[PDB]
Symmetry: C2
Subunit: 295 residues, 2 copies
């Protein structure tokens, strides 16, 4: 269902700090026409942490409405508050999302038993398939393979992982423990290539926002088992992947999209900021021009 290049969609804002609903709809249209296989509205890249409840819900609704069944929609539906996570996840089901992205809780640092309670509580409150977002570089704590396996075995409803660890040995461990049927998607653009060869079938991508075409071609080459051409694409994209993470990728992506002439404002919500260093904008520009993304 989820496979190949899946943008973690940005949330474009007007200069008045409202949701730019037109820009968001155009972005999704553009993503679909360029070859993106699926959408993740209101995830990290979509500035979930700085959306109100009603905005989060609006962003998911608008993505499901614009998608019109053409590509599957995996709604962001996970905070460090389980009851808020159930309300976001139920809203996403009732508005017609195809799947849920649920992050390992950040800040409050539950133990193993807490992860079981959190993911269990959510899994029992919806019928939609759930993807575990494992991202220790943001959450500090990391779901171990034993906990992940237990969850897959307990809830038929828990079907996959956004694995943003960048340690692809874990892709082999998760494949063996949870089975080949467990849907592993990369949460790290720079290691997505090696992730797929270890059992991955796709990447929930930051870079696909900026360069959906070539990201779709890269993932298509891998799924056709053409690893020589996948590697040619990696060499082209790797510098854009790295340059979008020099400063917060959310600001970097919006900067890039604006330079390409997409109707996406630079505006981000504090504590994110628009202002990037000249060196940062320089490295992004060079990486865009290496691929050849300017008309």
């Amino acid at each position: 269902m989820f496979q190949r290049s899946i943008p973690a969609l940005i949330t474009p804002f007007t200069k008045d700090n409202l949701i730019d609903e037109d820009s968001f709809v155009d972005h999704i249209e553009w993503q679909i026409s360029e070859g993106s296989s699926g959408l993740v509205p209101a995830g990290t890249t979509g500035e979930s942490s700085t959306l109100s409840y009603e905005e989060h819900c609006r962003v998911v609704e608008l993505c499901v409405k614009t998608a019109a069944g053409r590509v599957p929609v995996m709604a962001g539906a996970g905070s460090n508050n389980t009851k808020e996570s159930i309300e976001l996840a139920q809203y996403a089901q009732n508005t017609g999302a195809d799947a849920l992205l649920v992050v390992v809780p950040y800040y409050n640092k539950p133990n193993k038993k807490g992860l079981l309670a959190h993911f269990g509580s959510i899994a029992n409150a919806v019928s939609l398939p759930i993807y575990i977002y494992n991202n220790p570089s943001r959450t500090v704590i990391e779901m171990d393979v034993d906990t992940m396996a237990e969850l897959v075995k307990t809830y038929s409803n828990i079907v996959g992982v956004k694995d943003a660890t960048g340690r692809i040995e874990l892709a082999s461990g998760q494949r063996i423990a949870c089975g080949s049927d467990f849907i592993q998607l990369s949460g790290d653009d720079s290691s997505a290539l090696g992730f797929n060869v270890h059992g991955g079938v796709g990447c929930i991508s930051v870079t696909a926002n900026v360069a959906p075409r070539i990201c779709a071609e890269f993932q298509k080459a891998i799924s056709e088992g053409d690893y020589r051409q996948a590697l040619e694409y990696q060499d082209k994209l790797f510098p854009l992947h790295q340059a979008l993470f020099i400063e917060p990728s959310i600001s970097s992506v919006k900067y890039a999209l604006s330079r390409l002439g997409r109707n996406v404002s630079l505006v981000v919500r504090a504590p994110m900021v628009s202002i990037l260093e000249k060196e940062t904008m320089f490295a992004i520009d060079q990486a865009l021009d290496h691929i050849g993304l300017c008309a």
Copy 2:
């Protein structure tokens, strides 16, 4: 204004998962009579993350009304959403809080520029004094000394730091860059002793929830420079400091309180859980008996 032993108050909950207002009030009355010099309602130990906006506001209001000027109240008023932080901080100011505990944003990983816009935006929207809560083991990112020094120089209402790093060389770094007048409070019970001799005047404490008398006596000894005695207190408390974070401290503190016979239910909110391993409960019990509970 803020010195010695300052509990980060737990938020007790009824078996129906409402705020147990009676329990919170008794906990505050008890903390004040046992010698705690100050209160932090709705911090991390107060399960800030699982409180609704309404519930966070009620807990700060109730803490301030109960305290009735007897000890200064420092309201938890910081998320990883800058607009929400401002709202929390303004509610705290209007309901009569004496100061603001503002955490370095977690999960969304702002850069230096992001911190200055976060702490700067909050500083602009209130006249209360602000304490920076630096806790990289929860936030990943650490505010560096140059950033802390810049905020203190730029904004006369950024006055101190809850330093949870446990790396006391930073207390010295902070004292020289931000000056002697910069109010440093430990956010690490286990290293609070060495923090004070490096320049600190206090501890915002997890362990003070459970043993406020001995924690107050411990902080008194250091303020009187009786360091032989402060070390005797360190040796008595250390095993309870460590036993309360084998598992998450929220559960560990509420269990310990129930064991002392306080009117505090074990209830916590997901993703935290009440259930502690037998070995965990036994280590807390033995640490409580070492400070004379059985006796």
